[PDB]
């Protein structure tokens, strides 16, 4: 499913991402916008033959198993297909693991290049307090 902006903000906030590891809700919404356009079914192949899955484009090289990424690790202990559900619970739990891994949200290349240092508050303007 394709989330609305405020719909996704409310879901991310309900699952505890607002200021998780110090990253305000606008950072997560912005990241989702540029990784997936808010589309839980988004899949994109990386040059190394891994694939990124879901609303936060979680990568099969380290975090989920898709059975076709040699050397895969599956640190979130999930099939990558579970990251495409209309329920973002698995994506958010896995994102908590990723962002705690030491490098913060720089793990999401699109966040580093398109959200970092920008007015991310704009991404939650209109959601309900």
Swiss-Prot record:
Assembly behavior: Monomer.
Lineage: Eukaryota, Metazoa, Chordata, Craniata, Vertebrata
Gene Ontology biological-process entries: cell wall macromolecule catabolic process; defense response to bacterium; defense response to Gram-negative bacterium; defense response to Gram-positive bacterium; killing of cells of another organism
InterPro entries: Glyco_hydro_22, Glyco_hydro_22_CS, Glyco_hydro_22_lys, Lysozyme-like_dom_sf
Coiled coil: none
Protein name per Swiss-Prot or TrEMBL: Lysozyme C
All residue ranges annotated as the C-type lysozyme domain in the record: 1-129
GO cellular component: cytoplasm; endoplasmic reticulum; extracellular space
Biological source species: Gallus gallus
Binding site for substrate: 101
Additional remark text: Lysozyme C is capable of both hydrolysis and transglycosylation; it also shows a slight esterase activity. It acts rapidly on both peptide-substituted and unsubstituted peptidoglycan, and slowly on chitin oligosaccharides.
